[PDB]
Design a protein around this ligand. Structure first.
Ligand code: UY3
Lengths: 108, 109
């Protein structure tokens, strides 16, 4: 069950990546950090991924799953199931960021 | 000086039996542990005995509802003592694992 955790801002920029991403999508965390998740997305799935990130912030901590094609380091489209939820520390009024579990799954 | 809210937050991943499957490197500055020594160890092994029943009830709520807020509990720190924490738990399905957002309520310098 090859999966990695990532953290993103509201725009989709990777702000944290777990080192298990090298085995999942082939990139080191430093190659994903500061970049937008839509840049590694298949052009047919980019709008669905943008709309998903916009809606996960309105869903009050609930889980939103999205399937999309991610361009691996080895230049291949991998099917990914990303489960996302917003987190906002309740002791604060900081902007809510998104936490993800990204797994390579079968489209079958 | 004392740390901010973000610098006192760390993420963790767990299997349905509470064992650690991933831990943020941030836990080292806050509680002393290294993620590699926590892997395969149940989180229950670190709870303070007086928070035991409460954490059991919270884990049971997290399993039936899929998402929970733990409330205040203590976790045994590496070099002794206990830090107070508050976790937001979320189960990832399609049950696969539990994602935790852990915030250290204690004063950390
Ligand atoms: C959501 S909860 O029940 O409050 C909760 S707090 C927590 C936790 C996380 C840490 F990293 C350190 C620590 F001491 C406790 C866990 C849980 C879940 O029971 C679980 F995921 F199964 C196991 C881990």
């Amino acid at each position: 069950p090859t999966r990695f955790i990532s953290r993103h801002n509201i725009e989709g920029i990777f702000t944290f990546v777990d080192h298990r991403c090298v085995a999942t999508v082939g990139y080191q965390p430093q190659e994903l950090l500061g970049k937008n998740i839509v840049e590694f997305c298949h052009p047919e799935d980019q709008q669905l991924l943008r709309d998903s990130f916009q809606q996960v912030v309105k869903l009050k901590g609930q889980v939103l799953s999205v399937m999309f094609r991610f361009r691996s380091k080895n230049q291949e489209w991998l099917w990914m199931r990303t489960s996302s939820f917003t987190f906002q520390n309740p002791y604060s009024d900081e902007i809510e960021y998104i936490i993800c579990t990204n797994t390579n799954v079968k489209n079958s | 000086e004392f740390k901010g809210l973000d610098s006192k937050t760390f993420l963790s991943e767990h299997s349905m039996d509470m064992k650690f499957t991933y831990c943020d490197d941030r836990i080292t500055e806050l509680i002393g542990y290294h993620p590699e020594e926590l892997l395969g160890r149940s989180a229950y092994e670190f709870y303070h005995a007086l928070d035991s029943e409460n954490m059991t009830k919270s884990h049971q709520n997290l399993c039936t509802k899929g998402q929970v807020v733990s409330g205040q509990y203590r976790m045994l720190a590496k070099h002794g003592g206990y830090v107070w924490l508050e976790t937001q738990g979320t189960v990832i399905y399609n049950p696969q694992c539990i994602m935790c957002v852990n915030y250290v309520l204690s004063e950390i310098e």
